[PDB]
Q: What sequence folds into this?
């Protein structure tokens, strides 16, 4: 019988008690990254994260930091491989920058053969060290041209452009890459890119944020989510019909959270909690397992929710060989009004729920996950058991999928000095506490989880935060980015992997 | 009788001997700038100088500097006005960033009303201080979307997109702006952007520079020049047919140089010198005054030189109310082979001339203009009399045009410290020596020159050089860009203006 801790202090950092041998022998362990965050703009065209961070600098991070140079994994990809080799990692999740291989967005406009060669060299170097690539086709960095031509995922033109890009990636890399991810965290671009305008492209309703260049927070998140599902499904169809000879697998990436009632004896809170599961997970998992949105969304969102045609429904239903599930934290849910006629209405208000990290009797859900210096009441707290609850729910509700945990990790402040940043015991605690629960859910519930990829290989540009936080298991000095030095977390993960 | 110096030392910095009263009372004196160089990316979409400087960082400057933040004239436009007010300047030449008012390039895709308001506030603040705006519609910063859609000025689609952009600028600002410039220095984008790939967009033949993403240095400069002439002419037609009620004037900007024979008793050198005038100036002045390219270009360039249809010829011929002439230096010309079959052939080799600053008997043409630390044999030298020769030639060869000198200036090293940078006596010498010759040519040859705009108002991002050189008459500290402090040159120019 496995026991896992939920509260500080944790003791799971002792590899005598928890290590890779705790898991099945074929389980994959590694880390993850994304192209905008690590490569730099050298050698590629511009994308909407270049556009957004330059047009709206105060939304790029408090330091106005961006991915222009970052850790220069364009130049130093071999040092990333060296980190992985040092870890004895068996998987690496990275993303291809669409603007690096098709700068002009539409494939017929030409390919960047030097960009293709960059990924070929990376992929070959990973395989040569025994590392299995998990490659994300689209980690948010859409070519700027496509956003300016037709507003990217707001328009159905995105489907064919995304299909032709994927085709190119399968053609060029699929003989070596056997695990593909389509779109990073389905929920994020519709809500943050088109709803609150915290993320690129930065669209919203005028009274939500006067700085947005255009948008409608109440309708656009649904149109964009719809198109993401259709673009994903068209790419999976292409992969499974035209690249079956490669013997690989493909799936979407979901952002997962667990949700608990703010007040677990109040029926209103309990109902808000179940609504959250449907609005947050079901928005995409409904269509991916059934070809339809959840009925509560159909009922609430009404005319704002697009419909799938019978053909589209069939294309989207079952459009995965696995699910890449990112997991970071859990929230409590309580009821909140949905003012659909307010000029500041957003799609996120349609779930009729307010989300917190503290419940009605004052309990904070778990240890500190992210301190918010402008407002401490907005600090984020984590909950190790949420990864068990999420995996169990996916097995039970969503037809026992094959799952890879594609991201899991925690930041530490960018204000810390190098010595403090290297002594990242809070990261060891976060990672081990989640891995204990992950092993427990695989053993107790038989969830088909086959790998884990911690976020992040090394320090990088963090969406929305610049360089003001660090998520790496290896440290990077912003005054000289060549080296990636394992932190205490990296050193612990090395021992967990090869105990 | 006016005497002007050609060699150091100069004595024209004494305002008792040369000042604004030397010139006609209505003559305009000011300074110039350009949007990419001064504004920053805040509040605008991305353009090909963002694209090029980010994709090819070593071509942005030796320091990899770019226009991301620069002197932040988005925030500090009022400080620019304050510099001009301090100078008692009567003209300011600045450019509109197409990506600030039409981020998506094509007008039908929407306008950025906040961008329009930025220029309205600038324009109103200039007029309120008695400063006449001279506004450049296109100072190289093409929206990236247009370059990715159809390769910008490589395609004839540019004509209508440029026309619709100009229309917007005339509609919004023309009630206050009475001097418009279409395209900055016609010669530069075709040769440097599509020939040597030193400038955005960075196209060339593969063996000219392996880093170019695509191109053909032998044909593309001619196609791009052609389209520039057609786009310019369509915009002038639009202005003169639909905005005559505004009572303004419009013209192109030419980069001018004078050319002298490397050996002035050698017929081959003399012929190379006359070829240079035709290839450098005539390439555009031929079509602008006659609707046809020069016959030597027709003969040499053959099938690579596009033809104007009778309609196009008529549109381009006479398509100016004035000429904005930039002038910085002069070169000696000697013969050079034109290897049209070489894979590294460029359009610039078609003139059959090699250009130097030293003649056959070892004479350097004038004082140092730009030191080249990698190769001193590549130092640039200036020649004050060249501005007299250029203005005289334009009056004689090109039908006595109205002319405004739209740029004239000199850099000083970015390695100098603040005190050294403020003591910019070399700049006073450069500016006064050229102004002496300009007054002399207006008096002796009756050239219709009506204003002078020194380059630059303040230190900025310099195309190709980053922040490694400074051209301002006012200093900007890169660690805190708010202030613009008049240098000795600025202080001298103030006294020259109001002696
Ligand atoms: C898995 O996919 C199944 C479809 O392949 C889902 O079953 C379908 O569920 C829908 C309701 O969502 C049932 O459709 C209703 O059919 C009646 C009977 O003819 C309707 O009037 C009703 O339409 C009205 O309600 C709609 C909101 O639901 C409004 O949009 C519409 O304007 C009407 O006001 C609806 O009819 C649909 O109306 C909209 C049309 O565009 C659409 O094509 C039309 O079908 C439908 O009969 C049912 N199909 C089958 C084959 O059973 C299934 O839904 C789950 O199960 C069903 C039994 C219900 O309990 C659902 O509430 C529940 O979601 C879904 N499974 C999951 C878990 O989502
Ligand atoms: C100002 O614009 C005037 C036109 O409005 C120029 O005059 C025209 O000059 C052209 C030559 O450039 C004369 O055209 C020739 O006409 C004969 C007689 O019919 C031709 O065969 C000759 O064509 C051959 O040579 C061409 C290279 O010039 C090749 O491209 C072509 O394949 C032939 O091999 C040329 O005919 C032209 O051929 C190309 C067709 O596309 C074109 O439409 C056709 O006209 C032309 O007659 C003349 N027009 C008039 C009305 O005079 C004028 O040129 C200047 O003056 C003329 C007298 C010549 O001295 C030119 O050399 C000199 O440039 C130009 N002015 C300036 C200063 O450029
Ligand atoms: C968890 O949710 C539960 C269920 O909602 C909360 O318990 C309820 O709390 C209500 C107070 O918010 C109780 O109602 C009140 O009852 C007193 C005593 O009779 C009465 O004077 C009130 O005015 C009020 O009555 C309601 O008034 C509004 C009417 O529309 C409604 O019909 C009335 O019921 C309610 O009795 C109680 N329900 C139960 C099943 O216990 C619970 O609140 C916490 O515990 C209760 C016992 C009470 O001590 C609250 O102060 C305390 O906050 C909430 N838990 C937390 C931690 O917030
Ligand atoms: C400015 O250009 C002029 C005109 O080209 C240069 O003058 C010419 O310089 C040539 C040498 O480069 C002279 O030709 C030579 O004459 C000597 C004496 O007879 C003879 O031994 C040579 O081998 C050579 O002759 C040529 O050989 C090649 C044949 O194809 C051709 O037909 C022959 O002429 C030439 O006479 C001279 N022309 C004139 C009109 O003076 C001038 O060069 C400078 O001055 C000349 C006088 C001489 O001292 C050169 O050394 C000196 O560089 C050049 N000026 C500069 C500063 O480069
Ligand atoms: C978001 O886009 C929705 C739908 O286009 C707008 O909501 C609509 O408002 C128009 C004008 O009132 C209609 O009258 C509809 O009744 C209503 N439609 C639905 C489906 O709600 C909404 O106003 C607009 N939001 C903003 C901020 O532009
Ligand atoms: C530049 O583009 C020109 C014209 O398309 C190419 O020059 C041509 O080369 C093709 C193949 O040899 C032809 O055979 C032509 O005779 C010749 N045309 C002319 C007008 O010169 C040139 O090869 C190409 N340059 C590069 C570097 O791609
Ligand atoms: C690994 O952890 C297991 C418990 O899951 C423990 O029994 C085993 O001894 C540990 N392996 C090493 C080498 O410490
Ligand atoms: C941040 O930038 C936007 C312009 O992009 C502006 O609306 C807003 O005032 C700025 N925010 C703060 C808090 O200064
Ligand atoms: C499969 O590839 C073939 C050949 O290029 C093409 O005809 C077919 O449309 C492709 N697509 C899908 C998604 O099946
Ligand atoms: C608009 O929404 C903000 C946040 O969503 C909220 O604080 C405010 O009360 C709302 N105002 C109106 C008029 O509904
Ligand atoms: C920066 O880091 C690399 C790797 O440690 C080192 O070899 C190089 O000398 C350093 N560069 C400077 C300028 O300090
Ligand atoms: C790498 O992991 C394999 C598999 O568990 C193990 O046998 C090998 O010794 C490890 N290598 C190192 C250097 O830790
Ligand atoms: C200006 O220069 C002229 C010579 O061009 C001179 O005669 C006049 O006195 C000077 N004005 C002043 C105020 O020094
Ligand atoms: C500069 O960058 C280009 C890639 O954009 C590369 O071809 C070249 O080697 C670099 N130049 C130097 C001198 O290092
Ligand atoms: C003039 O503006 C009118 C009205 O918009 C339009 O019909 C005409 O095509 C325009 N163009 C030019 C360049 O004359
Ligand atoms: C190619 O041109 C470079 C510069 O234009 C020159 O140095 C070289 O000799 C040329 N090579 C050939 C093969 O023509
Ligand atoms: C920078 O310059 C402005 C203008 O001189 C000054 O007022 C401000 O205090 C300075 N900022 C810092 C941080 O030094
Ligand atoms: C500004 O220039 C005008 C025109 O020459 C002159 O009359 C006025 O005194 C000057 N102002 C200053 C402060 O120099
Ligand atoms: O889920 C995410 O979380 C990471 C941590 O916030 C972020 O850096 C990745 O790009 C993103 O996919
Ligand atoms: O001619 C120019 O010279 C200036 C000096 O090189 C440059 O900064 C301007 O942008 C350009 O128009
Ligand atoms: Zn940048």
A:
């Amino acid at each position: 019988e496995i026991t896992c801790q939920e509260n500080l202090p944790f003791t799971c950092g002792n590899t005598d008690a928890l290590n890779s041998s705790s898991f099945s022998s074929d389980f994959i362990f590694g880390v993850a990254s994304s192209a905008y965050q690590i490569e730099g703009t050298i050698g590629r065209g511009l994308n909407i994260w270049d556009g957004f961070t330059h047009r709206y600098p105060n939304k790029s991070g408090p330091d106005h930091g961006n991915g222009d140079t970052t850790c220069d994994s364009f130049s130093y990809w071999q040092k990333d491989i060296d980190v992985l080799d040092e870890l004895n990692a068996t998987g690496y999740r990275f993303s291809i920058a669409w603007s690096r291989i098709i700068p002009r967005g539409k494939r017929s406009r030409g390919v960047n053969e030097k960009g293709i060669d960059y990924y070929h060299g990376l992929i070959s170097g990973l395989i040569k060290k025994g590392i299995t690539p998990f490659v994300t086709l689209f980690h948010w960095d859409l070519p700027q041209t496509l956003q300016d031509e037709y507003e990217g995922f707001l328009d159905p033109q995105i489907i064919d452009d995304f299909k032709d890009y994927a085709d190119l990636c399968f053609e060029e890399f699929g003989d070596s890459v056997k695990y593909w991810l389509t779109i990073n965290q389905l929920y994020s671009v519709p809500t943050r890119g088109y709803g609150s305008a915290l993320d690129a492209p930065g669209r919203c309703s005028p009274t939500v944020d006067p700085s947005c260049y255009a948008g409608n927070s109440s309708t656009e998140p649904y149109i964009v989510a719809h198109h993401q599902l259709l673009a994903h499904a068209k790419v999976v169809d292409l992969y499974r019909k035209n690249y079956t000879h490669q013997g690989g697998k493909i799936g979407p990436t979901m952002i997962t959270r667990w949700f608990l009632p703010y007040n677990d004896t109040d029926r209103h809170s309990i109902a808000a909690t179940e609504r959250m599961k449907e609005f947050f997970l079901g928005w995409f998992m409904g269509p991916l397992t059934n070809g339809t949105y959840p009925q509560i969304m159909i009922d609430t969102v009404g005319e704002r929710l697009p419909s799938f045609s019978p053909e589209e429904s069939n294309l989207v239903k079952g459009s995965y060989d696995f699910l890449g599930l990112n997991y970071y934290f859990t929230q409590y849910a309580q009821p909140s009004p949905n003012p659909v006629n307010s000029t500041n209405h957003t799609a996120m208000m349609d779930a009729g729920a307010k989300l917190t990290y503290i419940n009605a009797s004052g309990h904070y859900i778990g240890p500190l996950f992210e301190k918010d210096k402008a407002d401490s009441t907005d600090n984020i707290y984590y909950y190790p058991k949420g990864i068990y609850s999420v995996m169990d729910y996916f097995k039970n509700k969503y037809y026992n999928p094959l799952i890879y945990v594609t991201e899991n990790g925690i930041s530490t402040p960018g204000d810390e000095n190098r010595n403090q940043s290297m002594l990242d015991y809070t990261r060891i605690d976060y990672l081990c506490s989640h891995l204990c629960f992950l092993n427990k859910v695989i053993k107790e519930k038989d969830v088909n989880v086959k790998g884990y990829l911690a976020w992040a290989l090394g320090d990088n540009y963090e969406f929305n935060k610049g360089f003001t936080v660090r998520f790496g298991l290896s440290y990077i000095d912003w005054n000289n980015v060549t080296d990636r030095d394992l932190k205490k977390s990296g050193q612990w993960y090395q021992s967990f992997i090869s105990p």
Q: What stands out?
A: The pocket of D-glucono-1,5-lactone (ligand 20) is lined by residues B 34, 37, 184-185, 255, 326, 407, 455, 462-463, 471 (CB under 6 Å). Chain A touches chain B at residues 41-46, 50-51, 54-57, 68, 103-105, 109-110, 112, 143-145, 148-149, 213-214 (CB under 8 Å).
